[PDB]
Design a protein around this motif. Structure first.
Motif, PDB file in Angstrom:
ATOM      1  N   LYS B  28       0.868  -1.156   0.000  1.00  0.00           N
ATOM      2  CA  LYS B  28       0.000   0.000   0.000  1.00  0.00           C
ATOM      3  C   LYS B  28       0.914   1.217   0.000  1.00  0.00           C
ATOM      4  O   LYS B  28       1.650   1.470   0.955  1.00  0.00           O
ATOM      5  N   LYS B  30       1.129   4.871   0.513  1.00  0.00           N
ATOM      6  CA  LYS B  30       0.357   5.931   1.164  1.00  0.00           C
ATOM      7  C   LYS B  30       1.163   7.233   1.248  1.00  0.00           C
ATOM      8  O   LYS B  30       2.333   7.270   0.887  1.00  0.00           O
ATOM      9  N   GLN B  31       0.522   8.295   1.720  1.00  0.00           N
ATOM     10  CA  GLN B  31       1.068   9.652   1.648  1.00  0.00           C
ATOM     11  C   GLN B  31       2.419   9.831   2.328  1.00  0.00           C
ATOM     12  O   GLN B  31       3.255  10.612   1.864  1.00  0.00           O
ATOM     13  N   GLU B  35       3.235   0.769   3.124  1.00  0.00           N
ATOM     14  CA  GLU B  35       2.887  -0.220   4.143  1.00  0.00           C
ATOM     15  C   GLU B  35       2.566  -1.560   3.525  1.00  0.00           C
ATOM     16  O   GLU B  35       2.026  -1.616   2.424  1.00  0.00           O
ATOM     17  N   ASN B  50       6.744  -1.281   7.259  1.00  0.00           N
ATOM     18  CA  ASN B  50       6.556   0.150   7.171  1.00  0.00           C
ATOM     19  C   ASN B  50       7.816   0.837   6.666  1.00  0.00           C
ATOM     20  O   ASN B  50       8.871   0.751   7.291  1.00  0.00           O
ATOM     21  N   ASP B  63      -2.418   9.756  -2.740  1.00  0.00           N
ATOM     22  CA  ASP B  63      -3.618   9.027  -2.391  1.00  0.00           C
ATOM     23  C   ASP B  63      -3.156   7.603  -2.200  1.00  0.00           C
ATOM     24  O   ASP B  63      -2.140   7.208  -2.770  1.00  0.00           O
ATOM     25  N   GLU B  64      -3.881   6.828  -1.402  1.00  0.00           N
ATOM     26  CA  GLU B  64      -3.515   5.433  -1.212  1.00  0.00           C
ATOM     27  C   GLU B  64      -3.539   4.717  -2.554  1.00  0.00           C
ATOM     28  O   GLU B  64      -4.504   4.840  -3.297  1.00  0.00           O
ATOM     29  N   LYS B  66      -2.980   0.736  -3.996  1.00  0.00           N
ATOM     30  CA  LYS B  66      -2.740  -0.684  -3.700  1.00  0.00           C
ATOM     31  C   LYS B  66      -2.076  -1.402  -4.864  1.00  0.00           C
ATOM     32  O   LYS B  66      -2.654  -1.524  -5.948  1.00  0.00           O
TER      33      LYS B  66
END
Lengths: 249, 243, 243
Positions: B28, B30-31, B35, B50, B63-64, B66
């Motif tokens: 993922k 993310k900003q 993750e 992480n 934006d997230e 995937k």
């Protein structure tokens, strides 16, 4: 009370690997003069002997000369996973058998190995009492080259003397191999008292040379007319690894 | 969206542990972090990753996003690099991930994005009876040694030492003590002793290349936790359930 | 004949390559050198190796043309016994070819001659729409990297840029080779596209050890010619058929 401390664990197992080449069972002997172990193949042609004089051990204690029979398969397995450089090795008597303990300096990891063992009375160390005219000294690497191209062409190696040269031939009338070794090309030392020639099993030479891995020091080879071959190396940290190879026809 | 990490090897090392635990996973993006969280095939062990944005040379995530993938496949592409080489991951649409591995040659992979069914893993907060810090190499050697004779790794915790041991027909005990200098840090609150699957511990051994020390935590009737504290701020946590 | 190849190792890789394609072959020895040519069983690969007099030192013939037949496995079996810095003196008679290594100590291997089918040679003389000159290192690197990812290598050109690709339903690998890229020494021709068996192009990689520079030829629905420039105007030409 019995205690053995050898300065280098890897070197110690180079011994152990060599005598446990075909069977994982081993008989170690602790005596007045130090440690020695022995193995013969079932066909009697390859004998492997380890000898460690006590003066080379850091710590040595025995109440009475004794032997220990142990299966070393496991220990062998786990120490190969002991990523270790300079680690020392201890074997102390246990109520049940042995206690191998290794310590890694960089990590601090004390791995102690508990193995079961049946104590006994000492085997007798003895040395083929025989006079070997030809002596050359060289390198485990050189021997490994020879074994590998000898085994490619045949089943039997024939070693002989010529004029200041050792000759190694193998194979049959079709595909022959022939090697000539001499002083500084590549031999470190060479002595020939009386001309001599003999023949040995390639497979058995292959294996004796396999036990020389982990021994970087000069290697001494000796033999004679229809006499055995002697191969012997001194471990850097001390102790001799020796091989005897029975002759043929 | 587009990130650049300067050493694909680091990422290799994590994905290798992942690939042995699971067939498919999702990074993922993310900003402020990348993750990854994955229960293994059999739902005994949880791996959590992480990777803070501070670690990346370039980091453009709004934006997230995937990125679902065949772990084993991502493995292949990460293995292409043998020296230190940068990895570039980008995406323009939800359907496609473009991976660039930069060396003397630039290897582009246009990967079709996988939608991987991801379940809500319930959140931890477990107190540990013991947590101790030893060297990763040591922990690798330790587990490697013991696994050779058993597939049940016993972990023992004491006021002054941690043992990694086997207790079957073979007996092996790898000790890290305070005085030995092996045990760098010891947070003690109760004697502990428990067993853990050796093959799960083997899947995970790539993780030891991520940090000089591994923080290891466990307790009676509690899971084993490996915590790998990476330079730059990265975090890989491995949570193994017991026998 | 009697010939001495000083770089015995590099030589060895030429033959190790040939063995992937042929199981038996002839050295054809003439005053101008040794030639080895053949076509693989599947009739997709046609190889042509030329080792000029000058390639060896002390090149000596006995007659106008000498045909020496050999099983590749066997010659390669003995050649596997090369040591890093040693030279090869290879010499022939009526019954047996003998290979002699000369380094730390002298070593020789004898090998009986065998009768090999020669009389029906394939001829390849073709003009190619696209030609590029390239470092063989850069070539083999990418092919080794790619060979794992698929059974088919797709190749094409646009505006003198050269693309190696691997197309799959689930991902695609892509490598741009170019002059400004720095990867290509030269490149010119039309925008053509083709595909080739990956397995066959890969075996070729070894020549890395025998040649530093290389020539690449192809075009729509014609063979890929790989020319491996060898010492002293030698060449190892490989013609692999399209799909």
């Amino acid at each position: 009370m019995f205690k053995i401390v050898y300065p280098n664990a890897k070197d110690f197992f180079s011994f152990i690997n060599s005598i446990t080449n075909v069977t994982d069972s081993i008989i170690l002997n602790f005596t007045e003069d130090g440690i020695f172990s022995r193995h013969l193949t079932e066909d009697k042609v390859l004998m492997a002997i380890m000898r460690i004089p006590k003066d080379v051990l850091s710590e040595y204690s025995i109440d009475s000369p004794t032997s220990v029979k142990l299966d070393v398969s496991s220990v062998k397995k786990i120490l190969s996973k002991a990523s270790s450089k300079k680690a020392t090795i201890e074997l102390t008597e246990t109520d049940s058998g042995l206690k191998i303990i290794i310590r890694d300096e960089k990590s601090g990891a004390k791995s102690t190995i508990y193995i079961k063992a049946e104590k006994g009375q000492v085997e007798q160390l003895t040395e083929p009492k025989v006079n070997l005219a030809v002596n050359f000294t060289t390198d485990e690497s050189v021997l490994n080259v020879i074994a590998a191209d000898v085994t490619l062409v045949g089943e039997e190696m024939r070693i002989s003397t010529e004029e200041d040269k050792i000759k190694i031939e193998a194979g049959e009338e079709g595909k022959r191999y022939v090697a000539f070794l001499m002083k500084d090309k590549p031999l470190k030392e060479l002595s020939i008292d009386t001309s001599a020639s003999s023949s040995y099993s390639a497979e058995m030479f292959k294996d004796a040379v396999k036990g020389l891995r982990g021994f970087s020091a000069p290697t001494m080879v000796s033999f004679g007319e229809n006499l055995p071959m002697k191969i012997d190396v001194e471990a850097v940290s001390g102790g001799h690894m020796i091989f005897w190879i029975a002759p043929r026809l | 969206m587009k990130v650049v990490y300067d050493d694909v090897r680091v990422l290799k090392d994590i994905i290798q542990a992942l690939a042995r635990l699971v067939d498919e996973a999702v990074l993922k993006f993310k900003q402020d972090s990348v993750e990854l969280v994955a229960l293994d095939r059999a739902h005994i062990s949880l791996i959590s990753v992480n990777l803070p944005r501070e670690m990346f040379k370039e980091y453009d995530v709004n934006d997230e996003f995937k990125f679902g993938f065949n772990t084993q496949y991502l493995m292949k592409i990460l293995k292409v690099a043998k020296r230190k080489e940068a990895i570039e991951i980008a995406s323009e649409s939800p359907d496609s991930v473009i991976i660039n591995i930069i060396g003397s040659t630039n290897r582009e992979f246009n990967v079709r994005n996988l939608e991987v069914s991801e379940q809500e893993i319930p959140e931890i907060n477990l107190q540990f009876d013991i947590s101790a810090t030893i060297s990763s190499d040591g922990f690798k050697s330790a587990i490697s040694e013991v696994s050779t004779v058993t597939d049940n790794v016993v972990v023992e915790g004491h006021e002054d030492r941690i043992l990694i041991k086997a207790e079957g027909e073979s007996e092996v005990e790898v000790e890290f003590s305070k005085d030995t200098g092996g045990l760098q840090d010891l947070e003690f609150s109760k004697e502990s002793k428990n067993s853990y699957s050796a093959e799960y511990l083997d899947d995970v051994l790539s993780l030891t290349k991520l940090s000089d020390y591994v923080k290891i935590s466990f307790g009676n009737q509690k899971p084993l936790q490996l915590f790998f504290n990476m330079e730059g701020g990265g975090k890989v946590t491995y949570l193994l359930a017991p026998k | 004949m009697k010939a001495k190849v000083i770089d015995a190792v590099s030589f060895s890789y030429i033959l190790r390559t040939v063995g992937d394609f042929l199981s038996e072959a002839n050295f054809i020895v003439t005053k101008e050198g040794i030639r080895v040519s053949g076509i693989d069983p599947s009739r997709v690969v046609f190889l042509d190796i030329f080792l000029p007099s000058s390639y060896f030192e002390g090149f000596e013939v006995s007659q106008e043309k000498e045909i020496i037949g050999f099983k590749l496995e066997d010659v390669n079996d003995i050649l596997k016994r090369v040591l890093k810095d040693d030279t090869l003196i290879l010499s022939s008679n009526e019954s047996k070819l003998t290979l002699t290594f000369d380094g730390e100590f002298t070593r020789s291997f004898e090998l009986p001659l065998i009768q090999v089918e020669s009389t029906q040679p394939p001829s390849v003389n073709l003009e190619f729409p696209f030609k590029a000159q390239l470092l063989t290192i850069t070539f083999a690197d990418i092919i080794d990297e790619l060979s794992d990812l698929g059974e088919v290598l797709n190749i094409h050109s646009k505006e003198n840029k050269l693309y190696f690709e691997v197309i799959g339903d689930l991902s695609t690998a892509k490598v741009e080779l170019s002059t400004d890229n720095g990867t290509l020494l030269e490149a010119s021709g039309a925008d053509v596209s083709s595909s080739y068996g990956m397995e066959y192009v890969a075996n070729t990689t070894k020549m890395r050890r025998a040649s530093d520079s290389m020539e690449l030829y192809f075009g729509s629905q014609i063979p890929l010619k790989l020319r491996f420039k060898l010492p002293q105007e030698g060449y190892g030409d490989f013609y692999i058929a399209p799909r």
